[model samples]
Target chain A: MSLLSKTRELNTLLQKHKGIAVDFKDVAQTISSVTVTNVFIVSRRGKILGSSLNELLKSQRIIQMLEERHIPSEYTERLMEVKQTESNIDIDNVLTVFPPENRELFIDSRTTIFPILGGGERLGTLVLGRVHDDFNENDLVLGEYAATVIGMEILREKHSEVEKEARDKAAITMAINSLSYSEKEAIEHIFEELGGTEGLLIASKVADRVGITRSVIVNALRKLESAGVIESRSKGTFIKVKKEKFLDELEK
Target chain B: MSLLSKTRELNTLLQKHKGIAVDFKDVAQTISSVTVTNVFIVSRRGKILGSSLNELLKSQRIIQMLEERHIPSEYTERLMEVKQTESNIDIDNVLTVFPPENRELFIDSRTTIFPILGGGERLGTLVLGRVHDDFNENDLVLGEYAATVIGMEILREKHSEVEKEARDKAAITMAINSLSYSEKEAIEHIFEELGGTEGLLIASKVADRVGITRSVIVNALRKLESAGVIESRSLKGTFIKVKKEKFLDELEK
Candidate 1:
């Protein structure tokens, strides 16, 4: 079947799969198959969202380049400029952008980089490397369409995440406000100090800072934990409660 | 230029423009130009989002068919089917789906309907009408890609609206809970009664239901309005305040 038919079929496959990772994997697989390329998609923030390469190779290159600050000016420039290129000169220019140890991955190969852009903003980049043959017009076209689809998918996922985060933050703020002034102070301190980690030592700090008794601070933390305002992990260490968990506690 | 070049160029245009309607209009224009078909996009719920045809013709048929319930069963079935068609058989089959009075708009036209589908759901339809000539493979391909882009745009637009609405509702709910008991009850009643309209009399009813004096209810309305928990339009008429307005009030406070 022609690539157009394949594009339709690929879209159908994308529609049926709900997870973004599976969608990216499938697109990468198809693009690699048709173009004889190894595929990887990286976010604007240097995260490897999905890839057809081995995890070790992908992670190592990113870590090395990022740590060494050697991701090359040309690659960073490409990210700023939303252009897809398949020319030998352009491909050769970008070759140095890769980690030197991983240069063997694209030896004697043609490289095409397509920026995953949507709604006038850059979301990510689509990097494809094929051995021997250069990309044809159809291959470029297919890659572009896939990039468009992937860009929209990324935006949708991001919007969902941002919406949830806003709601969760609002919920936490409201939950915190529904408490006695002293409990609010104690719990707020614990939240500030241990929003993501377990820290039992913060309770004493909260007590000293709030000018309250140790018993009062400790009791407040216990009360807040019971009320789902904060959580006690491993018996005494406290962490702030997330929205979903707080809601689940309320449901009971 | 090849359709591929055109697709890339079209995406660049879409990226530059921020509005959903312009994106749809541009896509419709491109599709119509390439396929020699008139294009119109309609929402799943029958709202005409964008169209290449003039406003009167698009609105007239939708209103008539939706009102009279004259749209045949097969068309709705096709919406559920999520399929694109170009065959003479399928095109002829859907021709009867049009309202009889507006059938003139598609006379001798090869009609192709593509479901604007994305992420496992149907968002809308891409209706194309080409006189005499049937849609070629490349035309169909272009139409399909355009429909996919349109579907994603719709979803993005929808998510934004929904996110804003959810935040607004939460903000209003929190704002109301910040008031005194009588003020909360009075304002909540006013919110329920005049969430979208003006109604000064609702304050008196709020007083009666909350067993408070008229001044207390009226004072609550005035205070809430001043605090941006509610809004007073014209003079005494009241409506609930949205999140942004409430936040703006807080910024001043």
Candidate 2:
């Protein structure tokens, strides 16, 4: 209930984009409702890929945080100083950036960084900042469960990429066998040029180069587009996206 | 051995064009050694899909033959009535067309028509002429075995067409699925327009009718050609040799 308070429609939004791109800002925002201050989703390698902070009121504060907080952000570096030894890292009265004065604030702010772990491995860190008090039982409990949603989304992205790669491989092989000889050769040239990447890939041009008829070259490229291997808007040649192994197999 | 003696590498050729179109002209030339005349491969529908008579001394005989002949020519229509009852229809002392005089030659010339039967059905007939004598027992035997080769070739053409149709059906569906929505609409419109064939199917022209993007029309056609459904020479469109039922299945939403 509290997580949805920070998010627009937590489960519904997740389900909608579940089939496509994963937006981590929603995950961080959902956790923001419990703390009312701010949240940051940092990768285990410590890149601040997503952030949800009310610091928008002070436009300079976001710029300051981002400027001071590049990928290996100072905030996460300090959060990382703990080596992720415990489930939670609590750093009290942090010498915070006081954007209003542009000097450090002597505020009694409390910062909590929770390790986002899935299957005993540290996937990332969930750092909550802008709070001026230590975390109580309820806040820590809320943070723990909120971290689960972030972990699941990350796993979904990882899995989606793997499935996409596999589908392309199978579809490629299945598409090739049915192609005409000229089509097969056109695709081979498209891939050969994918690595070369330095020249024009005009259909007639590649057709002449590959010794396939110029008449056949355009349709051959078109078939390759239908097959989802290479695509072109006009009658010209075009990439070898993840194609070396599959292309090699097609050769056999 | 006598069969091959009558034909040119008949068995070897039978193996080669077995799963493909039989260039019947080739089939007949292989038999030219036996007849010393020439040959014609004709279909029941009367399409003279092929022929092979070379210029020898009997050149005029064959010239008269083909001059009297055309693919799906008249002689086949006369021969078609028999239902392929016998492999060889040898007519001896037959008055042949006297092309030089434009009248019947009252000579001892002979003409024979052989049924190229496949699956006991008459697909077509092969007619040979200019022998000038009745076919003896050896020639009939050789002709009978040669009929077997021709029969197998015709059957292969029939089977080959069936396989090509099935392949196109599968490939059509496969190609359609991966197409973008507008491209699919364009293809459907193509089949629709196929039924009304009195107009030009310029991709942009069809695109206007089908409501697909003008930009996508050419590419859609290109893919269709790749799928072996439509073909074109210049960047426009041409229809041929492709279609059937499963395409109707795709018509439903």
Candidate 3:
């Protein structure tokens, strides 16, 4: 494990790990000051993905109890409240003051907590255990660097997962809503006949071909008529409305 | 055209419209004081579906300007801030106090804005025009009824839409996720052939059946393996995976 020297190098690693899911602990440990030992990456969703120290704290119910109350605890509240620019020069206000019980290792004068900030929300934090307030100047710079990486990596995934979930739902709901059994069969028939510019389909022919009642075909056709993909009309004896035979395909 | 004497009528209508979509104006008007003509149901999602006064406000840009500022307004903030129960007894804070220009028609001494309150969130508001500082006690009861109806009617839809959206999204994502294009074809083939609690499917056999590459079927099976649906240990070649599809179906592709 080598320490990161230049700020650009930390920025590079942060940018690189934006999409891929990697062990946050390994990244933090490798970049942290050599004297530093523990690191934790807590996500915006209150999800923690990190190394052994995090596991130890989690097992100790440190993370659990903190997240139980401190999910929006003073740690995050202070982060959101303060405009952090006045700090971060020598010793940033990145350190989250943990409660008395675990103060010796988790917070106190020995630890440094870097709140991961991105997209106008606190994504998570990276806490380093005792190496000159846990991390030296170089270490602090990279710690802030790691914060953005975690922010981009974890927040983007959480955000995208939410976004993609919304899309899939809308797609599925639209899928369920926009098509029904009769509509499915009817639409497929209209499409089958719609080869290139297949025009008006005869209702009886579609009804006969589908083996479903003409009324059912009519209902299905009416549903299809709404999606801009299909339409129906009646003019003379026995109508040539937009019809199709999707009977077999949708049955499954 | 009828004033609701019983508050239960408003509750019933709100309950009935839960899963269905209907014009909120019609529901609000039917249950409100006949004198209180205007109605607007402003949802948390910023949806404003209304009757006459709402239409006028939108046209006059009263709602628009408030929404322009208060659509996502600070008006709702003050509505939440000060205590209302002690205050609404005389000068009801229901008035949405519009700016100087549209003051007379939209919001003035006569307006009563029913803030639809919900779980720590203002779901929406129902603005009743001309229901002054004091409503006839019967009228006052109906006004309270309007608030809950708007709360349930608007919030329920907004809330259900979110819930269903999340579930369908998770299901579709899971369905697409646990399976892929090739796997979808491969699984359908296995189920087609198995016709029972199926056995492992051969990659090449499914490949030829699906007219896809052998590696493609193998890749598909491997994904299904992770889902515990399809398993392939070296004992025999890979086999037809999970006997059920939608167990995987509702989850992902």
Candidate 4:
């Protein structure tokens, strides 16, 4: 199929699965090899809407370019810019500040910049380039669609990250507070209420049932001990203590 | 035994435990109903040590009286002053910011403050109080020892909290970067290689493994799905689809 047809297909796939990267090889198998010097979706205000870089070196080079052009440092900046700028600009000979060993490949290569647009709103820019000047019009169109799809994907990913972080924090807090319960009661509850074993052997036994390492059980025991809910007589031997009494002493 | 003898016994227990709190009920059964408020050892800024309080509000009240005369805004200002002075002072009647309405009957009535001192350094103070005004000099001496033992406990707990936070951050960072690996491969590796079956199954097989609710699995699946490391078909289970070619395309260094 033509590159345009492939781009349309990929766009449809992206709609179903947002925040996914489509391989250039999948679309155009004829190209011997494609190396993305820098892949970033730029929006208005010099913002980087979404970016996926192959290596730290490439990311640094792209960051340098963005900085020199007064681009905003964050992803939101590029997303806003793309919405404002309706057209894509292809800069063939943009000077880059890559290290001496890497500068030649970026500066001398023919690079095509495609404006990612959907429903008349410019989402960002996709820079597609090659060491030898060999990209065609079809590649440019495909690059534009890819950029739009990736931009939307990244925005979704960022939001998900923030949400997961909040959940993890809450879980950790809950785990810590669990130490306030009597060690025996806590062990019984973890087994009876949460579903699992009882007694001093509970840690290792439950650890086995839960399929977690023995070390994790030991760590959990140590935390409970520190909280004064349980006391360990020796290695692997523990007993629950009254929480109220311990807390009373802790407060005093 | 007299309250004095009981106080002496409690002080001996405190010294033995180092920085652990001792139970007041264990020493005197009459005050069994009362809860210990605070316990610590104290010292002067240059020559401070520890103190403990067992069911006595008198000492704390005395500290408050001293503060009213010598310090400003006992709760807010005194703590800062002690920190700045790098020395410790044990005053009677140290007031806390605990709300009066929610204060337990025992907590309000029996609060006492003790100073922890060691090697001529005023480490900190411990305050213990309960519902009755039945404390004596014996309780004061015992409290001093208890306060000393508890000082080390607080430091240990604080260090553990900091370490836990650092470990949590590191784990999150690792999870984010592991997006490059295929979800199926990652899951298999977690289960087979790392022997992390429970951890892997926690996210995958959510319905069967975490059978209590669908919300838990749904939320976890949605996150992995959004990250593009995994995908779920309508009315179908989720599967790993992360490919290396895509990584190469997105990450052009």
Candidate 5:
């Protein structure tokens, strides 16, 4: 439909994805399609998180920069100011400012930067690249809106990580507290080796690491299963992670 | 500015607020300013978290409904369906469908509902009210954008709460792990009474509850201070909550 409708669709797409990297790929492509420009999202430290040029041979330059997290001194200084003020910056010529090895792809190229901000904090930046033109008003608005969504996604992703970490630790603590000394050691070994993976192969690996025979590890695992510390089913055995009511009380 | 710009402004406002309830008031007002319709955000269960009409006498009908979390049975059934399908629903003649006691205010009124969806889940609803007309395309667009933002704010608010709870518990657990039995009891008492608040007032309250003199509590607190489990500064003596690097290990293991 309209440009605004396309941006609204982008917002909807963001809500459906499970992670920010996946969303960034889709976002870069979607914005590129509408704005006729290349797009990439970068963390404040200058690591490229995702780019619209996925699978393009020309994307190597961006990939190289990401691998090295290398931004030219000229760009780094401006990026820091952008993050400091939470404002936009435009560079009219990237051929000279960017790495010389990548100059072939940057002839007459221009770049615009938008700060990804949330909770009054600069989380990252969104970069738009074009061959021979500066961004128009519509592009500016869309870039700002996308940056806003990127900030929200970043914050949400961090929150999810912290929440999951807390719950997993609480589960492990609760499980270990209930197991005997041997059972506790065995479970920790299994968790360390297999993590959430379950199968006879990794079970044997845990047995090997503990310097025990498979039967002995199997017996301890059986006890763990009976104690409700682990679960075994069609997929095989795995830690039956649980958060106790103690955590529930803490929510208040 | 365009309607979309107004909605973007709402998103910015949400990021500034420390809590959702306060942001809802501003959101309701901002959305109402452009839409020319009254705005209110409600939880999925029908609690009115905030409204555009802050202090008008006519807003009491909405306030009364919120206090009791009263939704007409007709509306509740529809709301459940909306939640199930993650779609919109419109109801006409609220004078007939809503609580009859509030009928006088809703004469010829119509209400449109938008589901606040995030991460494939229904978080809440946004409601726009008008005297006699149905919403136009512009209104519908604004409502949808507003709903998306409401979903984001709700998720962020929940995430913030969960993170704060986890950190606070980790801090308490870390602090309590190092104290003596009597010191532990005294510290727990102080935390319960003073929480993060510090000063002599609540310290005496904690002192009164333990059936001991204030000096006994103060001495225990001093020992706790020395142990680095709590702090006494210009603000007052308070639990210096901390999370351990052990938590860092848990990130990987």
Candidate 6:
């Protein structure tokens, strides 16, 4: 099929899913099936766009692991060199210092570069590869077209997630500030008003006056108790700290 | 009035103001009338609370300037020691490395300290002061109570502002990404759509497709023209370059 026709088909397919993941996998599968190896897509920021893995390692997992290790900058530089040198390059015998297991994975590989483009801009490169063979110009063109469509959708989703997180944080902060402290302060105030006597009976009488439920008053007292601000002995009994101890504690 | 009665009145008064500035000034004036020379408030994290001309200088300008100049750690260490030793000490002198002219504004001041308490938690310190006099105990008690009420309100406002800024940055990032195009593809599309077009017509059509106003389109074309993304002849139309010569300029900063 022509590139434009395939793009239209892919767009129609993408609309059916609520997310952008399918576009990544579809592009990777189409290229790898033709070339018979692994296919990986990378965004402009050097993040993995998508990948089709045949047997063992997924491209996303590999990139994430590399990121965790704080890998040397040389690998990204080499990738940039590869991006610039050939639309297609064979890495069958390139000198790589990756661990023995990883070195073998790409030793006999041929890679085709497809720069993902959309709205007249290049987002990133889509790479398709095969073992023991070379990639043609036709492979590069196909890979490029698929990457372009998928990259646009991925960018859109990422932007939306960031915006949502920010809005939620604002709402939580507002809720915390508007919370009232009237009930909490009433406990000490009632005792002072009654002239600091024992058997103060500071029970749920003050809770009703402050417009909070009995449960909320209980919770506030518990919170203050935890901070050593107030002490509660038997249920529904309390005592205010004397001025001397309060002043001494404040000094400390 | 007794401390509790005075505090209740101050708390009621503070609830009337939407912000800390007027309440802070009133507290300062009250402290001054009672012979307090220097007073200020600091958040639990040691950040200053409630803006004042002198407090603003000390907290925002002076401290930051000291850190940025990379002043010796030993000096800061000694200053911290002095602060700790004088926890209840009245300010007889305030000396800082700020310019000599600025030092005259705050030196040799008597100060009072009040703990800003909320929900039985110590939120911060409120310090008030005056020159050459001792602040009475009653005045000190009243100042402390005022600080406790006003400081809580200010802390709540500060938290709200922080949350709002975080949300705003996220919203701006989303808006930018919505307008973004992939690096190489955006160039190719623009070229193919308008590469050989003439006199303003190409821009209008591309603008229509891109869903931007004609004025925005014209402004973009002019920028592209200067950046060598496109070329325009005075009599003829503008043309898009087949190969991108200025790829680095593609992304907005």
Fraction of true contacts kept, per model? 0.34, 0.00, 0.00, 0.00, 0.18, 0.00
Which digits, one per residue and each the tens of the lDDT, describe model 5 over residues A104-170? 6555556677777765667777777665566665566567767776776776676568767764544
Tens digit of lDDT per residue, candidate 1, span B143-248? Answer: 7777777876676677668767776756665655545576556655655555433444555666677676777667555554533444556345444444355543
Superposition TM-score, candidate 4 onto the true structure: 0.25
Better of 1 and 4 by TM-score: 1
Of the candidates numbered 2 and 5, which has the greater lDDT value? Answer: 5
The candidate scoring highest on TM-score is 1
lDDT score of residue B225 within candidate 5? 46
TM-score of each: 0.67, 0.38, 0.32, 0.25, 0.60, 0.31
- Local accuracy of candidate 2 as per-residue lDDT tens digits, A1-252: 332232223333343343234477766776676576577777776666677877543556566556655433564555555533232223332323223342335244556666665433456777776535666544554454445446544543554466457545656655675466776777677667656423346665565664587767667656655666654543343333334456566667
Could you say which candidate leads in DockQ? Answer: 1
Q: Provide the lowest-lDDT 10-residue window in model 4 chain A.
A: A25-34
- Greater lDDT among 1 and 2 belongs to 1
Candidate 6 docking quality: incorrect, acceptable, medium or high? incorrect
Give a tens-digit lDDT track for model 3, residues B1-253: 2232243344334323332443576665654434454555555444556544533454455655445433435555554443232212212343344333444443433445555654435556655554244444445435544554344335445655676666545544544554555566765666566644456556667567668787656655555443344345645455454533444444332
When candidate 6 is compared with the true two-chain complex, its DockQ is: 0.01
Model 6, B1-253: lDDT tens per residue?
Answer: 4443443344333323333233555655444434324444445555433323344245455556434533334433333333211223433333232233444554544554555544334455555544444555545445543553344345444544676566545443332232324322343345546533322346566656865555655544444443333456643354444123323233344
Error of 4 at B17 (Å): 63
Q: Interface root-mean-square deviation for each candidate?
A: 4.1, 34.4, 23.9, 34.9, 6.1, 32.1
User: How do these models rank on TM-score, best leading?
Assistant: 1, 5, 2, 3, 6, 4
Task: Sort candidate 4 into its docking category.
Answer: incorrect
lDDT of model 5, residue A55:
24
What DockQ does every candidate get? 0.24, 0.01, 0.01, 0.01, 0.12, 0.01
Candidate 5's residue-wise lDDT over B96-201, tens digit each?
2233455555555556777777766787777777655666655666677677767766766776677677765564454344344565566556655653334333
- Can you tell me which runs of candidate 6 are displaced by over 4 Å? A1-12, A15-23, A42-49, A55-86, A92-108, A114-125, A181-252, B1-253
- Candidate that beats the other on lDDT, 1 or 5, i.e. the better one: 1
- The per-candidate TM-score of the B chain, in the order shown, comes to 0.57, 0.57, 0.50, 0.34, 0.63, 0.39
